[PDB]
Structure 1
């Protein structure tokens, strides 16, 4: 039913009543075979069908999902995201889902005004979770975060801090003794949710005077 999945996805987007339940049961069986490692080559085909449907009618499907079938859309997205999380092999489905999520986010930001983030909130949360990639700079990222702090962009600062936290969780480098001190007062002055983890990471593998920086900051 892999060929007819894309057509039922359009029926699932418009009106399904029980076809949505059947598709969700089929996807749970695929997740079952994926967890049991019993050759579950069904997630990518449904992902390909969903991506094709999005490329065909991005606005209509997003409007139908975020307007009427919010619950069914959220259930399908939750099934897809946990399935992608289980299937960590080669991240091909992860990249396809990231592209589909970016396109759906663009369509939702364009069209959904009254039904603001009924499921697009969970979509954006999954988007941030999947886009939490590992930074490779770890020295100019501090300057970028300092620039974002003067610019006062909350989402950009959160993304930069999340990147720097994985960057600190990666292999340690030689940190500057002035840039970190400047950045810590800025994230302290701003309400920073990840401030404690950032301070712990920057204080554990530190190539500088940690007590001096802490005393100066205090």
Structure 2
């Protein structure tokens, strides 16, 4: 009954009130036959009939489907999408279904003003899900994403992000290390729903130093909510804090923000002893450049002296109050710079007063 299938579909779409159950049963039988893969040559005929009915009537039919009978049209669209997703044999009826969905969307975007996305929402979602193709360049996508972000666009930015994610999931090529920071800053500034996925794709299989880029982003861009996410990238791909660049990490830890105590605890309980001693001797050294915050330096030193690994299982609180033996030895100029910065930072007195 493939010849009268288009007529039956048109009758059920316009006014039948009875053929809806028959169409649903036929769609269910076709889906079951496609799942069983027992020579299910029925979906192609239904797809061709639907394409012919949409090509014959595209203005009044779409309006009647989006205004009068929306439930049956949405159910038929869902069944067609399920059949196209299950029966993936060389994507025979996939192109025709995509073309029909695009034609229906183009007809409903101008002729359906009152019923705004009432029944065409499923078709739009299916078209957006089917448009997630893979880029064939994987090198110039960063410039396109930056242009879309600068042009203040939402759908274009989402499409660019999806294309970049698909290119990253595909065969990795020589990625650029120039516009990646700008793209990350734009995605952090603008409301991006796939910002975490984009960051993971850009820092998963890139041929560059993602740690320096993440540090520069966290130090320059004012990312409010996503900052913590960057903090994750500071503890996932960077085991030691002072591992790649000491100056930038020292400036990020001790400066002239919000994630400061967490990173301080990480550097205290996750760094090796030579690196810790090096940081202590370079921080407490004689330097008037104000390259270290004493407010964090004091409790950093207090935590390094009271590391729980230094006191593993000895008796609790049994020292000699006359003189402490276990101490941290320092040098002359080191202690001089320490007392200098201590007496210097204790002169602000914004609201503390005198006591």
TM-score, normalised to structure 1, is 0.97
d(CA) in 2 for partners of 1:118, 1:39: 36
1:29 is displaced (CA, Å) by 0.1
Q: Describe the superposition over 1:71-117 as per-residue Cα deviations: whole angstroms up to 9, x where unpaired.
A: 00000000000000001111121100011111111100120110111
User: Which residue number corresponds to residue 114 of structure 2?
Assistant: 114
CA apart distance, 1:174: 1.4
Question: How far is 1:131 from its partner?
Answer: 1.1
CA offset at residue 16 of structure 1?
2.1
Q: C-alpha separation between the residues in 1 aligned to 2:127 and 2:153?
A: 18
Kindly state the Cα deviation for residue 157 of structure 1 after the two structures are TM-superposed. 0.6
Q: Deviations over 1:166-188 (max 9, x none)?
A: 11101111111111111000011
User: What secondary structure is seen at the aligned counterpart in 1 of 2:149?
Assistant: helix
Give the Å deviation of 1:9: 1.1
Q: For residues 207 and 123 of structure 1, what CA distance do their matches in structure 2 show?
A: 39
Say which SS state the counterpart of residue 92 (structure 1) adopts: coil
In the alignment, the residues of structure 1 paired with residue 177 and residue 124 of structure 2 have an alpha-carbon distance, to the nearest angstrom, of 35
User: How far is 1:152 from its partner?
Assistant: 0.9
Structure 1, unaligned runs of 5 or more: none
SS at match of 1:151: coil
TM superposition outliers: structure 1 runs of 4+ over 2 Å: none
- Could you tell which deviates more after superposition, 73-82 or 108-117? 108-117
User: Equivalents in 2 of 1:212, 1:173: separation in Å?
Assistant: 21
Q: In the TM superposition, what whole-angstrom CA distance separates every residue of 1:39-94 from its partner, at most 9, and x where no partner exists? A: 11111111111111111110111011000110000000000000000011111211
The whole-number CA distance in structure 2 between the counterparts of 1:87 and 1:119 is 25
Question: Secondary structure of 2:107's match?
Answer: helix
TM-score, length of structure 2 as denominator length: 0.60
Deviation of residue 135 (structure 1)?
A: 0.9
2:104 match: 104
Moved more, 69-78 or 15-24: 15-24
* Residues paired across the two proteins, number: 218
* Counterpart secondary structure, 2:157: helix
Higher relative contact order (CA 8 A, sep 6+): 1
Unaligned runs of 5+ in 2: 217-353
Secondary structure (helix, strand or coil) at the match of 1:74 reads helix
Task: From the two aligned structures, give the one with the greater helix fraction.
Answer: 1
CA separation in 1, counterparts of 2:137 and 2:172? 11
* Cα deviations by residue, 1:182-214 (Å, 9 ceiling, x for unpaired): 100001100100110110111110110111111
| Structure number with larger C-alpha Rg | 2
Query: How far apart are the structure 1 equivalents of 2:108 and 2:21?
Result: 24
Distance 2:118 2:3 in 1: 30
RMSD: 3.8
- Corresponding residue for residue 85 of structure 2: 85
